[PDB]
Symmetry: D2
Amino acid sequence: MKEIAIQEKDLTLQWRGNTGKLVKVRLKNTRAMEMWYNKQITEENIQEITTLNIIKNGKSLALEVYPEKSIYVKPGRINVPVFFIKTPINRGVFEEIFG
Amino acid sequence: MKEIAIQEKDLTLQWRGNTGKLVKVRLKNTRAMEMWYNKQITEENIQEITTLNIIKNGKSLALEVYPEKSIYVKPGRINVPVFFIKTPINRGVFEEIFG
Amino acid sequence: GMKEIAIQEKDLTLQWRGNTGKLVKVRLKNTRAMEMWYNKQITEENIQEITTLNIIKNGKSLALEVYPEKSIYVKPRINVPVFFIKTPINRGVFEEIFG
Amino acid sequence: GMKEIAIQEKDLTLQWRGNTGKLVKVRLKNTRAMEMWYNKQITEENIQEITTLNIIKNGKSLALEVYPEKSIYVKPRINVPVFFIKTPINRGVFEEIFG
């Protein structure tokens, strides 16, 4: 287990059908640049993460990912990390949590 | 020397007179929460940072800080890191850089 | 007869049944409501003349009929206009349109 | 004589001389301009009737005279209104007002 918290405002969320299951989350370009400088997530360490703790509106939601599926996608200038979400969660409850 | 990059959108900037010198930068509450979970900056490690690399609009600007002055301020729910900026930079040139 | 007013989506708080279902009502944001108050763009006397809201966003437009007899001002300094949506539209298709 | 229109600050791109000096001109953002186009709120035929913009933000308001004979549409899909500010105001005091 390795958990990283990421504020929701830094993620582009892909919901199946726009309203269904959360399929994947992609880091925004600016936050990705920042992480590159800091080595916060790297191509070499990305698959160590098993949980994303999504932060927003003073609330937090831990979501397991499929670590074998985590990848960098182009780009922007540099590639951005993408996580495939394993814990089932749908858009309605996600919106309810974060308000 | 220890440098940390932080995207501008996560900082509340205090400009002397609103237009003059950058005096200090305060992390936003949500990013502060995220950093708390990750231990990215902590009360124990904050004074190790000598440079902030401010990221925005695909651009980057390194600014030295006064490490002895870096502190947590309340709050929000938890305290937030504050850096006092040593490198002189005024609002006009900062705006020019970041556009 | 018909009276249509366009409002940019960013000026609306949208209420979706169950967060993902039918669009039930939209409420103007506080800043925009104050602007409309100074301009008399929408007023207590005229709000019920509006039969259609043309929602604008991302260079796209979606006309939606309202129930004019349900249009009301609600408490926020300034009360704000609320419209009850008559044209059936769900969150998925709305997100599809506007992206 | 006088004709005054309120516009929420978030719908304006403000041009400050030297980024920190006098406010020279404001241009409507693209989304708001498209809305105003559908509503005929401001039009090529009427734009030069406006003598004062009432800038709205953070529950506050600031009236600024314009040079009506300088008000023009510029290329962005849709051309957008631009006003040249006559009332002298600088970035510091403007930021002070609105915070």
